[PDB]
Design an enzyme around this catalytic site. Structure first.
Site, mmCIF file in Angstrom:
data_model
loop_
_atom_site.group_PDB
_atom_site.id
_atom_site.type_symbol
_atom_site.label_atom_id
_atom_site.label_comp_id
_atom_site.label_asym_id
_atom_site.label_seq_id
_atom_site.Cartn_x
_atom_site.Cartn_y
_atom_site.Cartn_z
ATOM 1 N N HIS B 41 0.987 -1.190 0.058
ATOM 2 C CA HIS B 41 -0.035 0.031 -0.013
ATOM 3 C C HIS B 41 0.970 1.365 0.040
ATOM 4 O O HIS B 41 0.228 2.403 -0.196
ATOM 5 C CB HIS B 41 -1.162 0.008 1.210
ATOM 6 N N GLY B 143 2.347 5.559 10.104
ATOM 7 C CA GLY B 143 3.913 5.304 9.665
ATOM 8 C C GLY B 143 4.586 4.212 10.138
ATOM 9 O O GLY B 143 5.685 4.000 9.766
ATOM 10 N N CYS B 145 3.611 1.145 9.452
ATOM 11 C CA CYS B 145 3.732 0.042 8.562
ATOM 12 C C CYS B 145 4.879 -0.274 7.987
ATOM 13 O O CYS B 145 5.709 0.751 7.853
ATOM 14 C CB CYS B 145 2.756 0.519 7.438
HETATM 15 O O1 LIG Z 1 -4.258 1.177 8.740
HETATM 16 C C1 LIG Z 1 -3.229 2.038 8.258
HETATM 17 C C2 LIG Z 1 -3.359 2.485 6.845
HETATM 18 C C3 LIG Z 1 -4.130 1.573 6.272
HETATM 19 C C4 LIG Z 1 -5.331 1.517 5.775
HETATM 20 C C5 LIG Z 1 -6.208 0.599 5.314
HETATM 21 C C6 LIG Z 1 -5.639 -0.532 4.738
HETATM 22 C C7 LIG Z 1 -4.098 -0.701 4.999
HETATM 23 CL CL1 LIG Z 1 -3.125 -2.273 4.655
HETATM 24 C C8 LIG Z 1 -3.454 0.286 5.551
HETATM 25 N N1 LIG Z 1 -2.108 2.319 9.069
HETATM 26 C C9 LIG Z 1 -1.650 2.182 10.445
HETATM 27 C C10 LIG Z 1 -1.329 1.105 10.912
HETATM 28 N N2 LIG Z 1 -1.156 0.754 12.197
HETATM 29 C C11 LIG Z 1 -1.500 1.840 13.073
HETATM 30 C C12 LIG Z 1 -2.444 3.003 12.742
HETATM 31 C C13 LIG Z 1 -2.750 4.228 13.400
HETATM 32 C C14 LIG Z 1 -3.194 5.015 13.069
HETATM 33 C C15 LIG Z 1 -3.298 5.257 11.712
HETATM 34 N N3 LIG Z 1 -2.847 4.446 10.969
HETATM 35 C C16 LIG Z 1 -2.439 3.108 11.431
#
Ligand SMILES: O=C(Cc1cccc(Cl)c1)Nc1cncc2cccnc12
Ligand SMILES: O=C(Cc1cccc(Cl)c1)Nc1cncc2cccnc12
Lengths: 304, 304
Positions: B41, B143, B145
């Site tokens: 992503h 961030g 990820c």
């Molecule tokens: O979840 C997402 C972005 C995202 C959205 C949809 C699908 C996918 Cl594969 C990735 N990122 C984050 C990871 N971990 C913790 C977070 C905490 C706050 C904000 N984003 C976070």
């Protein structure tokens, strides 16, 4: 989201660990620049630990008796000195992996990461607090002596603890990197009183703010309290008295959540008086005190 | 003595972390040999995450669009490919700090250390379990990820997890290092059912044995149970059914303490039916399931 007992990344400290052997005792040493720091009891046998006269014991040792090995390579010892309860072994080679560092004496209630080591090799890393009674509730086995506690600010490692001893109660005692014990402890095989411990109030409040930030809010109530009223409750439950200095360091968490420090004190008062009623806060069924306000903001902001 | 939620020393993994940027998105990558692995992503904008067609999105990107920076130095991208939900960026330089490694798919109930990273820089390390429902209860911010989970056996790092997503419930989802999600998750901005989670019975029993080893024994009783009777209780309390394979891996802890596995099951049965009565076990007021039998023996034996 999520809140964990997070330790600092240990790589900068792993690069400093060495094995120190003297006679038949082996423990860990910390190699920074051209000096290896280790607990002075490396010069003792088990029979010596009863009532060791470290000055006399060290007089019988020469530079060549201190075997220092960094992974596979052997370090040449060109000097030795005792500073309080630590030995400083001057070696002929500066550690190429020496990070930027400082030696700090931490205050009770502050937190730090421990890199548990055996035979100069790292085994694990964990986060803990220096208890108000100057003990640490670590995880250490025989041979872990010389393992260190530290904090990291960007590229600088502030070393605050060197492990020396396990009390008969299973709790741990050690020194700053100048060899001064935290608390009343002496490096002797004798039963030693740790003294009354207390719960680190400012850290429990910081963790309650971390719970609100991460969505656990069931404990918030319609109440407020004063420093005086809260401290009557803190006295009853063996909590440290809260001061304006503690309220001041909780300011950033109060601003983030919009919850006044005394209102969060009223939530803490109610939890102390009523318990959790079978509920949990951030995956814990007790009030956690191993996160400082700085730890909560660092974890909830992602400082690297 | 003492028992902590211990993570593996993170140094070997810190040396692999890099920052990957594509367009306006930046996340973490894992640089092993001449390949950088990161969540696919990284090629999306926020508008794309609604229903991304990753094949089409990747077609618009070229090697020069993937900016990879290892600390301060820039890596030259000479190839790119998508494998499941990960991108593999071939770089012209092998990571000199590549440790001995393996890519493993862990089973639910197993544990691992996470090195949380932001902008290619490590922020902290913590230990956690892969839940039976294939989520992890991590501590991750935007961030994070591309941060990875791993285990270490002597000099070999077995990478088991790469972080991708936070569900609306605040729990975390990610993939193995071949880009296959653990659990039913898809890399899309859509609400996704995690499904019923359960408590990892074998790990709670292992932690009860760790408590006995470290001196917490108040919960030991005069009772025994059978696998069938225990499993009726496990069903009622949302615990995983215990099998002979679980009894077999608890063998070393049973031999160490002299407490038969079914006798420890009877202690667990009583704790599930009566609660802790305001008592604690290893500093916890709940039954802990994030330590495997292997973790307990490793921590109680000091494996480096
Ligand atoms: O979840 C997402 C972005 C995202 C959205 C949809 C699908 C996918 Cl594969 C990735 N990122 C984050 C990871 N971990 C913790 C977070 C905490 C706050 C904000 N984003 C976070
Ligand atoms: O306490 C000692 C040895 C000792 C004895 C008296 C005074 C001093 Cl300074 C040091 N070492 C260990 C440290 N941490 C944990 C342990 C666990 C088991 C066995 N030893 C342990």
């Amino acid at each position: 989201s999520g809140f964990r007992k997070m330790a600092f990344p240990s790589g900068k400290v792993e690069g400093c660990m060495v094995q120190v052997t003297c006679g038949t005792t082996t423990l860990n040493g910390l190699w920074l620049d051209d000096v290896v720091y280790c607990p002075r009891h490396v010069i003792c046998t088990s029979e010596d630990m009863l009532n060791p006269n470290y000055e006399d014991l060290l007089i019988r040792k020469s530079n060549h008796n201190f075997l220092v090995q960094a992974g596979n390579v052997q370090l040449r010892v060109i000097g030795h000195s005792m500073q309080n309860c630590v030995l400083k072994l001057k070696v002929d080679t500066a550690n190429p992996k020496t990070p930027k560092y400082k030696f700090v004496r931490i205050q009770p209630g502050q937190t730090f990461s421990v890199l548990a080591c055996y035979n100069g090799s790292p085994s694990g890393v964990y986060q803990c607090a220096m208890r108000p009674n100057f003990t640490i509730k670590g995880s250490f086995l025989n041979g872990s002596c010389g393992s260190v506690g530290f904090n990291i600010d960007y590229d600088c490692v502030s070393f605050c603890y060197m492990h020396h001893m396990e009390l008969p109660t299973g709790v741990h005692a050690g020194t700053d990197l100048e060899g001064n014990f935290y608390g009343p402890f002496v490096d002797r095989q004798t039963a030693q009183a740790a003294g009354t411990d207390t719960t680190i109030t400012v850290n429990v409040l910081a963790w309650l703010y971390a719970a609100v930030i991460n969505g656990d809010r069931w404990f918030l109530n319609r109440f407020t309290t004063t420093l005086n009223d809260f401290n009557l409750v803190a006295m009853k439950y063996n909590y440290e008295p809260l001061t304006q200095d503690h309220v001041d360091i909780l300011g950033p968490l109060s601003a983030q959540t919009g919850i006044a420090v005394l209102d969060m004190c009223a939530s803490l008062k109610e939890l102390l008086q009523n318990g959790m009623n079978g509920r949990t806060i951030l995956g814990s069924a007790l009030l956690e005190d191993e996160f400082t306000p700085f730890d909560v903001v660092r974890q909830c902001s992602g400082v690297t």
